[PDB]
């Protein structure tokens, strides 16, 4: 008996981008090429009550 | 190395007027009234059923 194979198939490793999904409504994005030189990001509010 | 200031924000105070809200439906206003010109003005109502 000759053992005939019928094809070597593979899983399609799909690209999944974070901006591609709709989870990126729950944040806004910003490309930062040197994030690791930041040690401490500080934001500030002022509430005139 | 740096600490980053990611901006700073404040609120805008709502300039609500008594005429801007609908409570002025309940009360008729005046052009003016400079007080202490009357202590008791004694506006008197002469109705007749």
From Swiss-Prot, chains A, B:
What the protein does? Self-assembles to form an icosahedral capsid with a T=16 symmetry, about 200 nm in diameter, and consisting of 150 hexons and 12 pentons (total of 162 capsomers). Hexons form the edges and faces of the capsid and are each composed of six MCP molecules. In contrast, one penton is found at each of the 12 vertices. Eleven of the pentons are MCP pentamers, while the last vertex is occupied by the portal complex.
How is the quaternary structure described?
Homomultimer. Makes the hexons and eleven out of twelve pentons. Interacts with triplex proteins 1/TRX1 and 2/TRX2; adjacent capsomers are linked together in groups of three by triplexes, heterotrimeric complexes composed of one molecule of TRX1 and two molecules of TRX2. Interacts with scaffold protein; this interaction allows efficient MCP transport to the host nucleus. Interacts with capsid vertex component 2/CVC2. Interacts with the small capsomere-interacting protein/SCP.
Q: Please state which protein family the record places this protein in.
A: Belongs to the herpesviridae major capsid protein family.
**Annotated organism of origin:** Epstein-Barr virus (strain B95-8) (HHV-4)
Question: What's the name of the protein?
Answer: Major capsid protein
Task: Specify first residue, last residue and whole-protein length for the fragment.
Answer: 51 to 99 of 1381
Localization, UniProt: Virion; Host nucleus
Q: Which domain of life is it from?
A: Viruses
